[PDB]
Amino acid sequence: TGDPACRAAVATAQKIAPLAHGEVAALTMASAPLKLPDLAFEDADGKPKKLSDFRGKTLLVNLWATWCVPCRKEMPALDELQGKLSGPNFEVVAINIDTRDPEKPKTFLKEANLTRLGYFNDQKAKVFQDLKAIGRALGMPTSVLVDPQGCEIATIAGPAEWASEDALKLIRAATG
């Protein structure tokens, strides 16, 4: 039995379920209340962050890595989504999980001119293990749409055209 603070998240998931088709058909709606683990990661300047620091906003939490081919390919879309919808009620939190060479993802984002995402990172890649433990990280990338209480609305095991019409419509619906 999940955290009852996450019941509104389930209702939200049920409300937007019809919108999960086309580009976002691989998004699986939450069917039970599920509080995500309070992921711990760093910002671009190495300051500690936690998922709960972002409570109060709807979020798309993404895990990506430079060694992940479909992840590199979807970073521009995530950046674009960030630019379209980031505001008082929504943010994309893309967390890099490279463990080998910390300068590599920074160079990747810079050469790709992706600056709206900042540079969240977990050089231990523990955040992947945390989501794997609740059955929400089956591969890479993994992205979870999270409500203002840190609860699961939906999870996708794979990449998506996140700046597409289908994706924006779904995210806006989840937010408001």
Swiss-Prot record:
It is found in: Cell membrane. One of its GO terms (molecular function) is disulfide oxidoreductase activity. It is a single-pass type II membrane protein. Disulfide bonds join C6-C151, C68-C71. Its main location: membrane. Residues 30-176 form the Thioredoxin domain. It comes from Bradyrhizobium diazoefficiens (strain JCM 10833 / BCRC 13528 / IAM 13628 / NBRC 14792 / USDA 110). Residues 1-176 are periplasmic. Belongs to the thioredoxin family. One of its GO terms (cellular component) is plasma membrane. GO terms for biological process: cytochrome complex assembly. Involved in cytochrome aa3 assembly. Monomer. Keywords: Cell membrane, Cytochrome c-type biogenesis, Disulfide bond, Membrane, Redox-active center, Transmembrane, Transmembrane helix. This is Thiol:disulfide interchange protein TlpA.
